[PDB]
Design a protein around this nucleic acid. Structure first.
Length: 192
DNA sequence: TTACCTCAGTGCCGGGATGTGGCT
């Protein structure tokens, strides 16, 4: 699978597992963690399985060991040493005022508080063209979208069941639900 | 009743969370 220019790190990895047929939990644990362990023990010890936990700004001190795991993937998938690292969210070296935590992604630093940790929404009008969870949704200051007739990002309660893509890793549909093919200022607010 | 006998720091404080070691 090739990465998209605007793709989240977790989206790419989910697609990769699935592309190789590693659809189930047990093989997700396996095709990921056990292979890493058998390369070297450190690539696995630094690598918890749950998806939310995988990104750097969720991590503690042993980041370099997690990076080594990214580097093993870079070899396995015929990559480049920074192909994935250009996508990851890391600890900024810049305080952003009053000792706040701030998070750095290839040139843009966004304060910790604007990261939309829970209830990621989606836009069916773009998902039907290329189905992968995209970046710029994880931002708190971002409702609606550019293009697509505007309107609202279709929000978490799709059908009497809260949605996201991390506690339940499907893109087109989630849990009990279906394939989701379901006021004129926010399109300016959208430009983050 | 009586007689006898001695030398730019620092110091708490909450709270949700990352990670680990033992049992099955």
């Amino acid at each position: 699978p090739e990465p998209f220019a605007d793709e989240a790190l977790e989206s790419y990895f989910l697609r990769l597992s699935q592309e190789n047929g590693f659809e189930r939990y047990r093989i997700f644990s396996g095709s990921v963690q056990d292979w890493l362990h058998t390369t070297d023990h450190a690539a696995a010890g630094a690598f918890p399985l749950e998806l939310s936990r995988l990104n750097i700004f969720h991590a503690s001190r042993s980041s370099g060991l997690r990076v080594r795991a990214l580097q093993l993937v870079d070899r396995l998938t015929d990559g480049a040493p920074f192909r994935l690292l250009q996508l990851a969210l890391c600890h900024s070296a810049i305080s952003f005022g009053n000792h706040y935590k701030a998070v750095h992604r290839s040139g843009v630093d966004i304060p910790l508080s604007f990261i939309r940790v829970h209830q990621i929404p989606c836009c069916p009008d773009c998902l039907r063209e290329s189905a992968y969870v995209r970046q710029c949704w994880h931002f708190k200051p971002y409702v609606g979208c550019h293009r697509h007739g505007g309107r609202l990002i279709y929000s978490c309660p799709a059908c009497g069941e809260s949605l996201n893509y991390l506690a339940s890793e499907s893109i087109n549909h989630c849990q009990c639900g279906f394939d989701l093919r379901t006021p004129d200022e926010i399109q300016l607010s959208a430009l983050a």
